[PDB]
Design a protein around this ligand. Structure first.
Ligand SMILES: Nc1ncnc2c1ncn2[C@@H]1O[C@H](COP(=O)(O)O)[C@@H](O)[C@H]1O
Ligand SMILES: [Mg+2]
Ligand SMILES: [Zn+2]
Ligand SMILES: [Zn+2]
Ligand SMILES: [Zn+2]
Length: 646
């Protein structure tokens, strides 16, 4: 079996740390229970000849160990030592070093407050002292990343909650999101405006060596140029990262698969499923058997593909935004190795119903019969599947909350109540559809959504303090284009509604630097409120939420900003709850499903569960609520359609 790449084991950590051992401070030590797996396989099977480690024939000393049955290194494919293995290299503006000398140069740079690019398991990282405000601001400036939170590597898990330390110390060694109150050493530029910080432990030997030496928290963010995939070769690192890093700690062991760090919450919730989980297969739900090989292309953002066959499914690693420059290459190498590993040959392809998608283009190039699944249908089905809902389980009411996904008849959805099973998706109601002014700009400039909401629902909106920056502009040009439907399509988007409220509270920059920035900011503000008595509501009118009443109560309910943000979450949860209750109860349905990237909001989840405690509630947990889980939803719907003989 090939298993995920795994965190350095305590045995290897002790060997690396003991003077006189052959692998004393060898940054490439591993054995049978730890080290890189998926990321070092060129083709099958898992044997030195077909890994990256065929380029390093074992010296006589390591040869003895490979043979020995009692040795912890019986058939450790990588193995090797400082005599025959890869070795570290350092490169920096007319400096070069190697081995221990290279390590020590990197350490000194990090101590000086500089930024170093470090070769990891599934790509490169950019690192600096997370306590040093100038270094972090310098890293942000050079990377053009003014706000998106930075991951941080801690030398030990001391002082973190039990749940976080448990998760951090697993062989997967994910980044775990933790209240930043627990980590006061970090500067404010790590996760500015947010309540959580993603922390991680050293999980390869080079990281261990570094942290033992530095004894402090280090930024440890992806070594990518913005709008580009992480570099996996030395050459690409050195080219992409030359204007960002002050030095490079690299090495001559190739990486053959891109494999980002995984991200989970301390709660257990999966956010990004990569290193340490891939390529583990998942069992399909009861009733799903003898399924033909289907390739599911997933979503254009936060992409994963899925391979469905027999009674199992295997997701790819996080591949990111499919319009990034060079991502198709990484996607295709992932699919090549994944097909090799599972001896998998697709007979069918499933992709999203949106004809504008990149993924949809790639499907047409395949020469297999193709089929289409509605975005939000796939979100709901991926949740049902994670909960092992049987093939013949019966209908649920689903709430699918995200930015924008294409719905029935070309509509733009993102705030929908649906009747769902594995074959059918009936649209029942949800948020009203409201223009996206300036098209793609509406996701980058929250105020555009406040304007759209105000022109639809808010009499005399120019008189409220919270619309002041919009009201003072020449907004009528844009209002005229909205009215005429010029690059102003309607979308029933939960994401855009959060953006309109964050624009009204001033809690995000006027123009965002990352997708969902304003929504995260608004959730972070709300989360600082313990709960408040307030009069804001979102009443049901027929099958839609009455936003005119929401806005009038919300704009006129003065309160500390954190209470205003909490009241929005509570009112939204209560309005969708009333909708889903009406719809489920009058259909004899007892189970509700929640999915879509907005369902990553923990406060909304808490409020929905509070209001809907009279139902069985299904929320995502081990796959992401967002687009990273979409390929699995497409897979089970394709499977169910086939199993029904359609
Ligand atoms: N904490 C949050 N609260 C509300 N909305 C969010 C949150 N995080 C992400 N979103 C929205 O959901 C979208 C991602 O959904 P998806 O495309 O399903 O992965 C983002 O672009 C945001 O518009
Ligand atoms: Mg602490
Ligand atoms: Zn080991
Ligand atoms: Zn050796
Ligand atoms: Zn989505």
């Amino acid at each position: 079996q090939i298993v995920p790449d795994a965190a350095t084991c305590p045995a290897c950590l002790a060997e690396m740390n003991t003077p006189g051992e052959r692998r004393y401070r060898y940054p490439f030590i591993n054995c049978t229970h730890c080290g890189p797996r998926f990321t070092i396989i060129r083709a099958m099977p898992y044997d030195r000849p077909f890994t990256v480690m065929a380029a390093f024939p074992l010296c006589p000393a390591c040869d003895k160990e490979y043979r020995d049955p009692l040795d912890r290194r019986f058939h450790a494919q990588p193995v090797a030592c400082p005599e025959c293995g890869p070795y570290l290299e350092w490169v920096s503006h007319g400096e070069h070093a190697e081995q221990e000398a290279a390590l020590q140069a990197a350490i000194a740079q990090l101590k000086m407050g500089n930024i170093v690019a470090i070769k990891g398991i599934g790509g490169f990282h950019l690192a600096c002292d997370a306590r040093n405000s100038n270094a972090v601001a310098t890293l942000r400036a050079r990377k053009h990343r003014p706000a998106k939170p930075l991951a941080v590597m801690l030398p030990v898990a001391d002082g973190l909650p039990d749940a976080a330390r448990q998760l951090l110390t697993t062989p997967a060694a994910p980044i775990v999101l933790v209240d930043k109150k627990y980590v006061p050493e970090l500067c404010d530029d790590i996760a500015p405006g947010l309540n959580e910080v993603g922390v991680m432990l050293p999980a390869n030997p080079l990281q261990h060596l570094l942290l033992q030496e530095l004894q402090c928290p280090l930024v440890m963010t992806s070594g990518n140029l913005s709008g580009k995939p992480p570099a996996i070769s030395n050459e690409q690192a050195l080219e992409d990262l030359q204007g960002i890093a002050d030095g490079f700690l690299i090495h001559n062991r190739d990486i053959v698969q891109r494999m980002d760090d995984s991200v989970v919450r301390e709660s257990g919730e999966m956010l990004r499923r990569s290193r340490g989980y891939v390529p583990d297969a998942l069992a399909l739900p009861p009733g799903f058997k003898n399924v033909p090989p289907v390739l599911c292309l997933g979503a254009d953002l936060k992409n994963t593909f899925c391979l469905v066959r027999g009674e199992q499914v295997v997701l790819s690693q996080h591949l990111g935004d499919l319009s990034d420059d060079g991502i198709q290459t990484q996607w295709r190498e992932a699919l090549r190795l994944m097909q090799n590993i599972y001896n998998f040959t697709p007979q069918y392809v499933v992709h999203d119903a949106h004809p504008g998608y990149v993924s949809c283009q790639w499907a047409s190039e395949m020469n297999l019969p193709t089929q289409t699944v509605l975005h939000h249908h796939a979100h709901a089905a991926a949740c049902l599947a994670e909960h092992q809902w049987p093939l013949d389980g019966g209908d649920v009411i689903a709430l699918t909350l995200d930015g924008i996904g294409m719905g029935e008849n070309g509509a733009l959805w993102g705030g929908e109540c649906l009747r769902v099973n594995y074959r059918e998706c009936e649209h029942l109601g949800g948020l009203p559809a409201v223009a996206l002014p300036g098209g793609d700009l509406a996701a980058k400039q929250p105020w555009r959504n406040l304007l759209a909401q105000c022109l639809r629902f808010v009499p005399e909106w120019q008189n409220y303090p919270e619309t002041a920056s919009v009201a003072a502009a020449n907004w009528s040009v844009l209002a005229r284009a909205i009215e005429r439907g010029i690059n102003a399509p309607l979308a029933s988007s939960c994401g855009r509604l959060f953006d309109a409220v964050a624009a009204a509270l001033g809690c995000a920059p006027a123009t965002l630097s990352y997708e969902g920035e304003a929504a995260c900011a608004l959730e972070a503000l709300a989360a600082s409120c313990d709960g408040v008595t307030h009069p804001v509501t979102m009443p049901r009118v027929d099958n839609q939420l009455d936003l005119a009443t929401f806005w009038q109560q919300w704009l006129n309910w003065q309160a500390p900003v954190n209470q205003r943000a909490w009241a929005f979450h509570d009112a939204l949860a209560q309005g969708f709850a009333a909708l889903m209750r009406e719809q489920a109860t009058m259909r004899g349905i007892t189970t509700l499903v929640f999915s879509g990237g907005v369902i990553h909001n923990r406060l909304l989840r808490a409020r929905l569960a509070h209001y809907l405690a009279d139902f069985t509630l299904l929320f995502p947990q081990s796959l992401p609520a967002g687009d990273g889980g979409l390929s699995l939803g497409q897979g089970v719907i394709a499977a169910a359609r086939w199993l029904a003989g359609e």
